[PDB]
Structure formats: C-alpha cells, structure tokens
Amino acid sequence: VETFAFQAEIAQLMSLIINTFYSNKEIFLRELISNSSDALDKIRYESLTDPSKLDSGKELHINLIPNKQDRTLTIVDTGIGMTKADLINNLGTIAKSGTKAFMEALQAGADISMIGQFGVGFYSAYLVAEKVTVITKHNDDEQYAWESSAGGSFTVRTDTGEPMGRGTKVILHLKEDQTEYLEERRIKEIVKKHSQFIGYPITLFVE
Amino acid sequence: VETFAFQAEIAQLMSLIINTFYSNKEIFLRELISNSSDALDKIRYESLTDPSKLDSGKELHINLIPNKQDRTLTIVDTGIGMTKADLINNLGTIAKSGTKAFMEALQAGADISMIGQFGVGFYSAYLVAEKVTVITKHNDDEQYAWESSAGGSFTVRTDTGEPMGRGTKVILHLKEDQTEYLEERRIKEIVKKHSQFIGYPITLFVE
C-alpha cells in the first residue's frame, strides 16, 4: 500500500467541501454520473477507430448500487477507467488549476453546485461520504484501488478484489446522517432531476 | 483536397440545426468556448506528466476575433488540437451516439440549447454560420483545414496558411442576418452571460 499526500490545493478543496455549510448535497450524484458519462464517451470514441478497445467489455453503462448493511452507495461504469498514474494525478483531473478557478468563481458569486464546471466534481463525493474507495481498470494498466477519508492523504494499491474488465467503481462510505442516499425513491428523484438525459443506461439496483 | 460525406446522423443533426425555428442562437458561442476549454484542459493534463507537451506553446488561452470586412467570427484556442483522424471522425466527438441521445432528449422536452450535453455542441455553429472552417494543429500531426457549408459534405486539406503552434481555430463565416455576433457589445454580453467562469483568459479582439 502506497500512501500519498494530496497537493495543498486539493486538500483545501476537500476541507472546504467537508466544512462549508451547504444543504444541497444531492449534487454529488449528478457529478459522479457526469464523470462516468465522460469516461464512457472516451472509450466509445477510442473504439470508433480501434474496435479491440472493447475486448475488455462491449457494454457501456452506469450502475447505482445501494447497500444499507455496509452503508455504501456505489457508482459503477464501464468507461475508459484510470491508469495508476491517472489515479495519483487527482483521478485524471486538472485539480490544481480547476480548484483555483472554482475558488475564483466562488469569490464572484458562484456556489458549490457549480463544482463540476471546474473539472473537480469527483470531490463533491465528500459532501456525503466519510470515506471514498475508487476501484478502476484501464486497458493499458492493472486494476487499482484508491482510497481516502480526506485529512490530507490517499492510498493506492493493486486491487485483488473482484476483477472489473474495464471501467471505474466509486464506493461512497456514507456519513451516518446521509443514509437518505441509500433509499430507492431518493436516488430515483435525484437521477430524474439531474441526470435525465445522460446517454447511457443508468440502472438503480434494488436490495 | 479530400471530400468526405457526413455520416447520415450528423447530416440530419446539421439539417435540424439549420432548418428548425430557434431564436436563441447566441448559445453557439458558449458551446465553442466550452469546446476550447475542454481542449485546453486536455493539453494541461498531458503536460502535468510530460512538460515537453507545451514545447509547441506554453500559453493556454481563448481569443475571440471578429472581422466585419470578412464577416467572420473566429474562436481560437491553444488547446490540444485535433489530428487528421480526429477531424474526419466528427471533430473528436462521438457524434453518432451523441446525436441519437440529443434527438431522444428533444423528444422528451429538451431544447436546442442543451446540445452541448450530448457532445455535439460544435455543430451549433450552424445556427449562425453559412460555412465553418476549422484550422487545427495537434502535437502528433500536421496542420489541417476542415471545412463545410453543410449540405452533406466536408473537406480536409493540409493547411499551408499561418502556422498555429498548437490548438484550434474555428472560423465562422456568418449568415447575412447574423452580423450582430461581430459587434463588441453583443459578444461581451454573451461571454458574461454564458462563459463568465471559464478557467482560461478569454480575449475579445477589437477591430
């Protein structure tokens, strides 16, 4: 297990997300689904000129999996996935410059819901999760698990868990007061509100 | 000069954009600036692990250049640019699947302004342009000019014009009744309305 320090700007972003009073927490799900859609677009685009890109899986979809026993909400996609280098480099984001632009935007009257416009919407997971685990598999690398309970550090290890073929799994270990996002009708409401026109099938699993 | 037929779905998209009555045409500029921002994000991200990616130019910006004599509005960026293969493959988009999802969305009550959510916002240029010329330079390829007045076909040729270093230039040859988008105060209004928080400097050139 390798342990890394977040760059200062990302640690600041995460602390802001965790500590700022902001009731409209539901946007985390929109942001994660949007990320999954972007990843699915990328592998689709690559497959247009190289069909073998889909040998690791032809299905392009997003699954939402609540588990009340574990108190986890998992967002799974069969998108392009992330390399180890991607994971370490702020999960494929330009988080340093993105965080700066987001802060500058917040200064000029923006609010936290606009986070995704700055390329750092992943970190909105910390609106509802005390810990986030990301399992990912990219065609050009092995399967890795990234994890962080914030507080300035994350871990990366090779994943010996269930193989995924290709894509990303975001596991949200929810805060004790945020279990509403495990309820079927709440998830359905949020998906209909914010992600109605996403161009990949979104399947909400039942328990 | 090589001439190509648009895939059927893209020809349909373009005809819909050209022929549908829709007064809110200004969104084209938001969509092109968004594309430029995405391209700038991509070269930024690549440069994080490979600084030499910026040997073709360190500046990351967007320029808006009106020219009333030529009746053109040009959007220039120093983003990642496009390879020849990218240009031919619907300017780096998943236009076939994107167009389908956009149509399905329009069926379920969406309107043309949401085009960018489906990865085909480039084609909104045809709300205001009778012809569009795209000059582009990607680190891994030569400089190319793509062009189309719609009507089912586009051309690609090697560009012998002014070298660009790296990025993309979208030249909008405006319709005779759409010259308002050459006026400084109109462009400023649209940028402030729709692109206020874009994380790269946007410079509106004067004439």
UniProtKB/Swiss-Prot annotation, chains A, B:
It is found in: Nucleus; Cytoplasm; Melanosome; Cell membrane. Changing residue 31 to A: Strong ATP-binding. Strong interaction with HSF1, HIF1A, ERBB2, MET, KEAP1 and RHOBTB2. No effect on interaction with TSC1. It comes from the Eukaryota. Residues 1-207 are annotated as: Interaction with NR3C1. The modification N6-acetyllysine is found at residues 42, 68. ATP binds at residues 35, 77, 96, 122. ISGylated. The TPR repeat-binding motif mediates interaction with TPR repeat-containing proteins like the co-chaperone STUB1. Homodimer. Identified in NR3C1/GCR steroid receptor-chaperone complexes formed at least by NR3C1, HSP90AA1 and a variety of proteins containing TPR repeats such as FKBP4, FKBP5, PPID, PPP5C or STIP1. Forms a complex containing HSP90AA1, TSC1 and TSC2; TSC1 is required to recruit TCS2 to the complex. The closed form interacts (via the middle domain and TPR repeat-binding motif) with co-chaperone TSC1 (via C-terminus). Interacts with TOM34. Interacts with TERT; the interaction, together with PTGES3, is required for correct assembly and stabilization of the TERT holoenzyme complex. (Microbial infection) Interacts with herpes simplex virus 1 protein US11; this interaction inhibits TBK1-induced interferon production. Belongs to the heat shock protein 90 family. Molecular chaperone that promotes the maturation, structural maintenance and proper regulation of specific target proteins involved for instance in cell cycle control and signal transduction. Undergoes a functional cycle that is linked to its ATPase activity which is essential for its chaperone activity. This cycle probably induces conformational changes in the client proteins, thereby causing their activation. Interacts dynamically with various co-chaperones that modulate its substrate recognition, ATPase cycle and chaperone function. This is Heat shock protein HSP 90-alpha. It comes from Homo sapiens (Human). The chain holds residues 17 to 223 of 732 of the full protein.
